[PDB]
Amino acid sequence: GYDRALSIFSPDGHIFQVEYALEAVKRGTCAVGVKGKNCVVLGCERRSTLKLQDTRITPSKVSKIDSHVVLSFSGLNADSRILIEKARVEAQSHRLTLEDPVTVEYLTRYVAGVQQRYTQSGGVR
Amino acid sequence: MDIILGIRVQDSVILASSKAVTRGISVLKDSDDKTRQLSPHTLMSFAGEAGDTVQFAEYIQANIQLYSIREDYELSPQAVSSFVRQELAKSIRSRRPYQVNVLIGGYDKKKNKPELYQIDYLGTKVELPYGAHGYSGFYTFSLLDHHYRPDMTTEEGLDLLKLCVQELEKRMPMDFKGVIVKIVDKDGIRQVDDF
Amino acid sequence: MDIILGIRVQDSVILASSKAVTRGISVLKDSDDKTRQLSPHTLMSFAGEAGDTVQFAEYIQANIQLYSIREDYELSPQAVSSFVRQELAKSIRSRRPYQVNVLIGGYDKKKNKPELYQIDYLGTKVELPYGAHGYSGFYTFSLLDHHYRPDMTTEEGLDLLKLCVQELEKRMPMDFKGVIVKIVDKDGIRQVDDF
Amino acid sequence: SDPSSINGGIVVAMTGKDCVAIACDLRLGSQSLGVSNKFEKIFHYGHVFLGITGLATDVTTLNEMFRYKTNLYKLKEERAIEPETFTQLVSSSLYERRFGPYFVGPVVAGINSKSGKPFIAGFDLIGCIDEAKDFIVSGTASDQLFGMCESLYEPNLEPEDLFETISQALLNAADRDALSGWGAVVYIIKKDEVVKRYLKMRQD
Amino acid sequence: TQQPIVTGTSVISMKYDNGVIIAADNLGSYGSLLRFNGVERLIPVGDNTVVGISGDISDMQHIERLLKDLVTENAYDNPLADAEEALEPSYIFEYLATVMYQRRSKMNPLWNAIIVAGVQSNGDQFLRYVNLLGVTYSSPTLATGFGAHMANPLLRKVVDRESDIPKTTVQVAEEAIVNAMRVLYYRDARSSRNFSLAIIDKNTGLTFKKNLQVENMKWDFAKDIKGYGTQKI
Amino acid sequence: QFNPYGDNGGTILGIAGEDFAVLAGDTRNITDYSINSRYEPKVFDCGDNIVMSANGFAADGDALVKRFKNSVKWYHFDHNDKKLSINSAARNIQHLLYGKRFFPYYVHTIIAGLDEDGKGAVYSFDPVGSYEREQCRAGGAAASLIMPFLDNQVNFKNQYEPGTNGKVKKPLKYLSVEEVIKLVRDSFTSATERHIQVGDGLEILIVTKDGVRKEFYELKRD
Amino acid sequence: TSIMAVTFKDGVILGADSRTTTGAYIANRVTDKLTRVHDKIWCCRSGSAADTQAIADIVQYHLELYTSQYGTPSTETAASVFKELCYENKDNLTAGIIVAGYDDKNKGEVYTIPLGGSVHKLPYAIAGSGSTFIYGYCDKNFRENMSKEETVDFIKHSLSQAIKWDGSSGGVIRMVVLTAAGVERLIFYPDEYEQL
Amino acid sequence: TSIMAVTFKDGVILGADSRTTTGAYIANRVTDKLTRVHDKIWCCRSGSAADTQAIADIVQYHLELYTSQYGTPSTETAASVFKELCYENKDNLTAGIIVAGYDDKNKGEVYTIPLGGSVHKLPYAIAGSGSTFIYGYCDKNFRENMSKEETVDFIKHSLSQAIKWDGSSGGVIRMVVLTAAGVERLIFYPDEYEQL
Amino acid sequence: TTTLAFRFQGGIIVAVDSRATAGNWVASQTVKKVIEINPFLLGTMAGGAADCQFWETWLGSQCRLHELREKERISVAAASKILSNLVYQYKGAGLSMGTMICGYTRKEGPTIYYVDSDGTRLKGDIFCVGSGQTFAYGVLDSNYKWDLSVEDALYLGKRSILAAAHRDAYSGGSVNLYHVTEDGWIYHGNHDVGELFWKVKEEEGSFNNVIG
Amino acid sequence: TTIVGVKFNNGVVIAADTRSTQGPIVADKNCAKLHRISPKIWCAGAGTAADTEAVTQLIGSNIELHSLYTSREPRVVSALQMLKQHLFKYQGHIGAYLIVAGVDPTGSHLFSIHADGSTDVGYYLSLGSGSLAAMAVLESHWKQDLTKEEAIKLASDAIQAGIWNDLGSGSNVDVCVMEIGKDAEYLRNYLTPNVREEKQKSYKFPRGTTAVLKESIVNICD
Ligand SMILES: [Mg+2]
Ligand SMILES: [Mg+2]
Numbered sequence A: 001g002y003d004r005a006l007s008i009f010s011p012d013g014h015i016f017q018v019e020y021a022l023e024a025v026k027r028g029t030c031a032v033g034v035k036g037k038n039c040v041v042l043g044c045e046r047r048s049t050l051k052l053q054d055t056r057i058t059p060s061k062v063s064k065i066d067s068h069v070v071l072s073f074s075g076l077n078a079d080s081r082i083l084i085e086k087a088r089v090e091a092q093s094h095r096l097t098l099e100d101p102v103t104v105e106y107l108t109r110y111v112a113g114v115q116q117r118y119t120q121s122g123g124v125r
Numbered sequence B, C: 001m002d003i004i005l006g007i008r009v010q011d012s013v014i015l016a017s018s019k020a021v022t023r024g025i026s027v028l029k030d031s032d033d034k035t036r037q038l039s040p041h042t043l044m045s046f047a048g049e050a051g052d053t054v055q056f057a058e059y060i061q062a063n064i065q066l067y068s069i070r071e072d073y074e075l076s077p078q079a080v081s082s083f084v085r086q087e088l089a090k091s092i093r094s095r096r097p098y099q100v101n102v103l104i105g106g107y108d109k110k111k112n113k114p115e116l117y118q119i120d121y122l123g124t125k126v127e128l129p130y131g132a133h134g135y136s137g138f139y140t141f142s143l144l145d146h147h148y149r150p151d152m153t154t155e156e157g158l159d160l161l162k163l164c165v166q167e168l169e170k171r172m173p174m175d176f177k178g179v180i181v182k183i184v185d186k187d188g189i190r191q192v193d194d195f
Numbered sequence D: 001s002d003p004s005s006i007n008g009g010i011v012v013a014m015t016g017k018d019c020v021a022i023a024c025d026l027r028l029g030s031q032s033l034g035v036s037n038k039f040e041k042i043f044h045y046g047h048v049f050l051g052i053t054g055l056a057t058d059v060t061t062l063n064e065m066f067r068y069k070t071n072l073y074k075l076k077e078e079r080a081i082e083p084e085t086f087t088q089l090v091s092s093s094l095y096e097r098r099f100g101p102y103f104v105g106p107v108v109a110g111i112n113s114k115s116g117k118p119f120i121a122g123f124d125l126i127g128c129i130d131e132a133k134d135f136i137v138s139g140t141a142s143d144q145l146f147g148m149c150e151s152l153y154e155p156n157l158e159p160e161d162l163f164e165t166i167s168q169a170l171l172n173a174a175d176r177d178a179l180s181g182w183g184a185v186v187y188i189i190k191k192d193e194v195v196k197r198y199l200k201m202r203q204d
Numbered sequence E: 001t002q003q004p005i006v007t008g009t010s011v012i013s014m015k016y017d018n019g020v021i022i023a024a025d026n027l028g029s030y031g032s033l034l035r036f037n038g039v040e041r042l043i044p045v046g047d048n049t050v051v052g053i054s055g056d057i058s059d060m061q062h063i064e065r066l067l068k069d070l071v072t073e074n075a076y077d078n079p080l081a082d083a084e085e086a087l088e089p090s091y092i093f094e095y096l097a098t099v100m101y102q103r104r105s106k107m108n109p110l111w112n113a114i115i116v117a118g119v120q121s122n123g124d125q126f127l128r129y130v131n132l133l134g135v136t137y138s139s140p141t142l143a144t145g146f147g148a149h150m151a152n153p154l155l156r157k158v159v160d161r162e163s164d165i166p167k168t169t170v171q172v173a174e175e176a177i178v179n180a181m182r183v184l185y186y187r188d189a190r191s192s193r194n195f196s197l198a199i200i201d202k203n204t205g206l207t208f209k210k211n212l213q214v215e216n217m218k219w220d221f222a223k224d225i226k227g228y229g230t231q232k233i
Numbered sequence F: 001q002f003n004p005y006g007d008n009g010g011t012i013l014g015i016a017g018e019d020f021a022v023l024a025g026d027t028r029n030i031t032d033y034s035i036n037s038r039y040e041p042k043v044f045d046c047g048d049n050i051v052m053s054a055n056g057f058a059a060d061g062d063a064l065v066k067r068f069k070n071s072v073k074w075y076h077f078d079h080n081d082k083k084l085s086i087n088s089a090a091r092n093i094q095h096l097l098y099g100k101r102f103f104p105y106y107v108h109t110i111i112a113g114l115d116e117d118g119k120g121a122v123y124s125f126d127p128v129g130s131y132e133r134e135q136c137r138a139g140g141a142a143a144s145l146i147m148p149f150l151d152n153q154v155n156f157k158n159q160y161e162p163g164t165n166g167k168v169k170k171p172l173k174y175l176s177v178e179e180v181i182k183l184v185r186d187s188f189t190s191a192t193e194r195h196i197q198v199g200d201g202l203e204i205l206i207v208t209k210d211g212v213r214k215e216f217y218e219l220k221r222d
Numbered sequence G, H: 001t002s003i004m005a006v007t008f009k010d011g012v013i014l015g016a017d018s019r020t021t022t023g024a025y026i027a028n029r030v031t032d033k034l035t036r037v038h039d040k041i042w043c044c045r046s047g048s049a050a051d052t053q054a055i056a057d058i059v060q061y062h063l064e065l066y067t068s069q070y071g072t073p074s075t076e077t078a079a080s081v082f083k084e085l086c087y088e089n090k091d092n093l094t095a096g097i098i099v100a101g102y103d104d105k106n107k108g109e110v111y112t113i114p115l116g117g118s119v120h121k122l123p124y125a126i127a128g129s130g131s132t133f134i135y136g137y138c139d140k141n142f143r144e145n146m147s148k149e150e151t152v153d154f155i156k157h158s159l160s161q162a163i164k165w166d167g168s169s170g171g172v173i174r175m176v177v178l179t180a181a182g183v184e185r186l187i188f189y190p191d192e193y194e195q196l
Numbered sequence I: 001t002t003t004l005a006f007r008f009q010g011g012i013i014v015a016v017d018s019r020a021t022a023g024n025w026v027a028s029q030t031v032k033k034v035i036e037i038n039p040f041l042l043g044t045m046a047g048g049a050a051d052c053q054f055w056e057t058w059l060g061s062q063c064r065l066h067e068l069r070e071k072e073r074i075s076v077a078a079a080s081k082i083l084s085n086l087v088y089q090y091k092g093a094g095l096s097m098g099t100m101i102c103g104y105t106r107k108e109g110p111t112i113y114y115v116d117s118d119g120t121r122l123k124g125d126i127f128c129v130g131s132g133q134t135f136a137y138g139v140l141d142s143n144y145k146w147d148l149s150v151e152d153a154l155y156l157g158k159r160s161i162l163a164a165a166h167r168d169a170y171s172g173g174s175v176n177l178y179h180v181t182e183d184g185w186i187y188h189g190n191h192d193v194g195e196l197f198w199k200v201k202e203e204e205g206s207f208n209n210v211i212g
Numbered sequence J: 001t002t003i004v005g006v007k008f009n010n011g012v013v014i015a016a017d018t019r020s021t022q023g024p025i026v027a028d029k030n031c032a033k034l035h036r037i038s039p040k041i042w043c044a045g046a047g048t049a050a051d052t053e054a055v056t057q058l059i060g061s062n063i064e065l066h067s068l069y070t071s072r073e074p075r076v077v078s079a080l081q082m083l084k085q086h087l088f089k090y091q092g093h094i095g096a097y098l099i100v101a102g103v104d105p106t107g108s109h110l111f112s113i114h115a116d117g118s119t120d121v122g123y124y125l126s127l128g129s130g131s132l133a134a135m136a137v138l139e140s141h142w143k144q145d146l147t148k149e150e151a152i153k154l155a156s157d158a159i160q161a162g163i164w165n166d167l168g169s170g171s172n173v174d175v176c177v178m179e180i181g182k183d184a185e186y187l188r189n190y191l192t193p194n195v196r197e198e199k200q201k202s203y204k205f206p207r208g209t210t211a212v213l214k215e216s217i218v219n220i221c222d
């Protein structure tokens, strides 16, 4: 298997590949989350250099992970699908074994854990 | 386990499933629901080897729920039944096969038709107006051959089912402790509380 | 066959015996009287191998009736029970043994005491305050250990028996279709019609 | 399907000074199900005592058989059978069924009426005589009885002491066997008085 | 899982005051066929240990190779290979015992019973048994197969407990072993007349005797035995 | 077909005092109707004031004892020479046995020592690792002969206070090491009389806060 | 067992080892497998010791009764009686018997009776487990009309080899010489025959 | 099968019958059971034809590879390779093989490898079902340092007898002579050997 | 074994015997067949002593890890399901377990799950499990009402195990009693059948089949 | 069992141990395995205990009736023939393995009978589980022309080999000597090398220890 340590420390203590991943996020369309007294709203910019789009079918920016939890994102779209698919699988696996849907904190911790794992594993960015 | 039936009428599918769970010479439970909702308009009843039954049902349930979330869409009964069959067809040549028989009752919203699928542990699928697994069928199939009509109402279906349960309660050697009855139609899945 | 019970109270012996006869997956009959009057104050209930049961019961019945005519006298329950035991004890080392278990309830007129004898197919005899054959005892013996008293009336006995049947109807896997109950006392043998 | 351990039960016998003791539990079961708490396994024909463990139908049958044979003996011999002689009759009778045997472990105890000697003997199911000065054991807790007796026993115990010894041997052997217990009876036997005592023991 | 084909019968042995004796016949049976007659079943390891093997001969030859290779390995980077770091009998035994139990645990046994006889560097006598199941035990006398039934009773008359060992000379002990070998030849239908014997002594070292024979046999009384009951002539 | 199990006979016995514990076992090792050895010990000092016997199939018993001794060695290496408490030993041994749940060690295992309050402790195991602390336990071939005796003489079962109408039980109390050794010796001589696999010798390991002592007694050799 | 019977010029000689076995244990190392059923009619026994003894005992009884009524029986007659028992009870016997006797009309005769209870009249016969190993040898070395000393040597060498290879066979080599002269018992110990 | 290999003054001779059997049916009456694994290292095959062939084919491959790297292998080496295969796969083989070869240092050598995969170096060796019947004969008639003609006669007579008694053996007697001179194939038809 | 656990007005009763057998050999009379997983969770043991003992203490380790990771006590549903999913992996291998996972949580209330080695998992109000289960059922069922006082409930549980200890040869030794409430579990003593039988006979007037 | 027979100058001697087993349990520690068939024909028996007793008693009975009928002392070959034909008829199902010996008008005789009906003749014989231990001694020490006292020693030594080395054999040595021109001497417990050691403790209980529910006088008279 391809094994290279891609995320590594530099002399100043930074992991440049992680920081460069942040720049990809900074380049992504804006997304915002505001929580009310009795709700949460997720808002998302969609850049307008694209007309002739088909809005029916184009992947929407907010994804349902389970019927009670949603995930939005800024950054590389193709990357986001991988995190969403894993999150959706874990959501069903949690219901199967614990007989209760995920807490938002749990689901977040899982997704966060996946992201961290890709920062100290060989062969991946 | 043992008794699971299904009848498809004009506008709904009705599943009836025995309530007893017996291990040895003891009825451990008389209120067991041998069914899982796979999607809002699809219900699966099941019977077979202890443990295997629920483990399989819940595994299928998890898989269909995952699909629903991923596509924000509900698989047709035909699609679900085909997925289930394939899963069982794999299982039969495994190291340890799932020994579970199932009925899948669903309302297809695109066609506005109810649908009943009978599938045994080998992955043998058939669509039927009425179906059963185990010894049940040896009494009920002949009775439904006689009294069943394709244009029946949900209420006519329930009475037809009451006949089946009456016969089983007369001639079956074991006390299966009555049935839980569920109706699957255009408005989803509901449970008849008095039967 | 399957369920046969017996309770001896102050002034009578009560036998309760299931009504079902099952061959395969069919209950052929739900009103079977698993009992024979051996003499006016002696009743024998029985359960075991199909055919063997009745053949044995009727054979014993014929023998006791013959004795009664020859002596113009009624054998005591103890005497009858000992005759029955010996017959079974012979049988067990035969080419083909009778596979029949019995309860013998009798009222001994010389002692004015009711008597209950439990005898299995090996010819194992015991006199008991209450007895059962088959899986029945696994539920009822513990229950009678608790609620039974030696000075009970026939009516208290019947209620105590209703508890036993209720428990069996809750926990037994098979539908034995209720019981026929018979009382043996100083006035002979009568059948309770509503149970 | 092992006939000697369907019903369960035990018998033990011991000699003392000018006395013998024979004891048995009271259980009769059908495998795990206990059925009767009143099934005595010790019988007597005149002054000769016989205990029998094993298949209960054969226990009953053999009692009825030895009563039959000892009654006829007495009528023809014009005297009660002695234990040495009865022991021989038991052996004859079991070996007669050599290839279709009674599934039993009989034990004989008694005091010879002429010599005054205490006497005990045990038998296998096929009639072999095990004679002993000290003790005989039998039943489903026979291993346990062997262990109790072999440590607890001593010769020439007085009747009141022998009672304690045999009762303790039986009780503690019974409590390590699932198929023995549910009551106990002890017979203390002297030249011309016999005392029967029911023991208090655990009912599980 | 196996069945033994070519087999060796008893290995017998005992301790005496200064050392140990061990013996075994030279036969490789093939069922009831007495097929091979030049088979050495005592294998010396160094000048302080002899390993006697019974049971399957194909597995015995495998063990020979293991022991021969063990010697080679112990010499590697070992300046004291013929001195303080020479192979002890206790080392050789624990190795075989380890292998035997591993093989039984993998359901593929070496179909043998083995006795390791020798003298440790401190002068102590070593005698221990191990078999196909990995079962091990020590005793003043040890024998395999028929030997356990017929030799041990004879050898135990000489050394019945630990305290009898200093009182037993090599002359007495060898007499008993040689006598035991005769008895087994009378009575074991898978034995041969020819055998080997080895003495390991804390003073005289290893003496290995080949091509011995059972002698001084009683057969003369055979002539008087006629019929099986009533026959006179 | 190859049978990977054998039966080496013998029998063992653990009794726990107030400030001591004994673990006894005969020294006879058998297969079928032959004696392999009249003195082959099967009760071992494993360190940290823990004695152990694994009785039944000797090859399995030796492997187990070997592995537990090795477990004790690594417990020291990994936990700063900490003493392995008897309760911790028992639990470790459960995992050793249960690790072979589907190809078990054919042994009844008993260990003895002192608990962490200085009180005598005996633990016994079934072949797959069920374990229980007890005052008293015999294991092996003659366990059925010995155990009911110990119920009577160590825990005073079925013994009542004279005159009390069997209403007051004989009161429980700890026994001296002198009394316990008497009960052990009598247990084994009785067992030797009536069980063919038991005989030759008896070796007792006693455990106090001062360490591990031994005592050996002859048993009948027939 | 290794057994054989050999006709020669003056009569017939029977020979046998002396090993009786129960598994690999030698229950008897000095057995006598050469058995008299009449003055000059003998047999060699192989198979179950119990079966062959019970049979020989019955045959001896029959021939004693034959003798009392009709005089001396022929060797053929003796062999027929053996056969009848062996054939009719073939399901419950393990007996391989060689019958050998001396008439004055018929001289030496050998009949062998294997497991089925068939009868086979032969110049010589070999039987028992050890016989397998000397078919080659015996076929190459047997001649008709040998002398007594030649026949004794043939048997001694043959059984020596059978004993050498068959672990079930062993002990001494017993022989019985049947001629007009009478009946002679010979024995040969290991130290002689082993080193032939 | 009946097979054997015999060392003698000038080298070694291998011999074999030619019968291959499936039950009582003779699948091949002219089989060649003497098989070359090297110029002057040959083997006699008995047991399963498939097993012994598969084995010989593997051994021939090994010795060809040995030869390419280290020169001519010893007969001991060839026997060791046979053993390794037979021993390590003892559960799945029915092969009784005799290995025979000629060195110039070691002259003639014979190693026999029975079912277990043990190795036994011997002056001569016999194997196969037919061998049982000639243990007696061969032990009595074998001498060391025989001449070529004497050895050919010993083998011819021995296998003649094995064939006479063993129904599994039969056909022709093949031999292979291994000496410093080279390799010679001999054959002997029934009409010759049957009436020895 | 005989074990039971029932739900009622005032929480959960759990009662077990203490016998262990090797065939007809009574191996122990003093076995602990209840395992305390946490202050609010109990597990009962029937079948293979080792299997139950080992996997139910293992269960406790898994429950402890759950509350470290989720900062919250595990639900009875989830605890029972860890054990049942574990045994289902071993299905066919020959594990022997009849267990009941009893406990209270805020979200569930008092809850009992039957879990066995064929992989069966059932929520329920009453279960009896073991070789003496039928005897315990007979008594328990006939005297059970939801409204029982804590005092009467404890006795019924104890009396039901007694019933089985008496009749079932493979049950006995002593009774171990537990009560589980909103505040957790409370132990209610070890009750030797030696004394309990005679005490109950006298005080209750039951067990007339027995020579008094 | 271990049993033996040894011939000497003027007669024959037989011996046996005294252990009886049921599996690994010792049922009888002092059972008599030397059986009288007639006054001067004694039989040592191994195998199924009841079978050896019954078959020995039955033939013993028929020998007595024969002796009376013929007005002659019974011969060993008669007992041998009657025993073997009986046992053969039963095809081994009567598990009696017998060493038959005695003196009669014909001389002194020694035979063995297996269960199955096969008989052997010899100067020294052994049967039973301990027969190999015994035979090892007999093969080591037997010679032609033994005295009575030498034969007894050899025989009892052969039984001892069984007692010590065979788990199927133990306790005592019984001997019977049948010399020509003399009464047979049955030496019951000729050796007793397995006397139980003094117990450490008396287990005699305080009177009143055992809880009692009822008493009653039992009537044994008429
Ligand atoms: Mg109980
Ligand atoms: Mg012994």
Ligand SMILES: [Mg+2]
Binding pocket: H048, H051, H092, H093, H094
């Ligand atoms: Mg193959």
Ligand SMILES: [Mg+2]
Binding pocket: H163, H164, H165, H166, H167, H168, H169, H170, H171
């Ligand atoms: Mg041919």
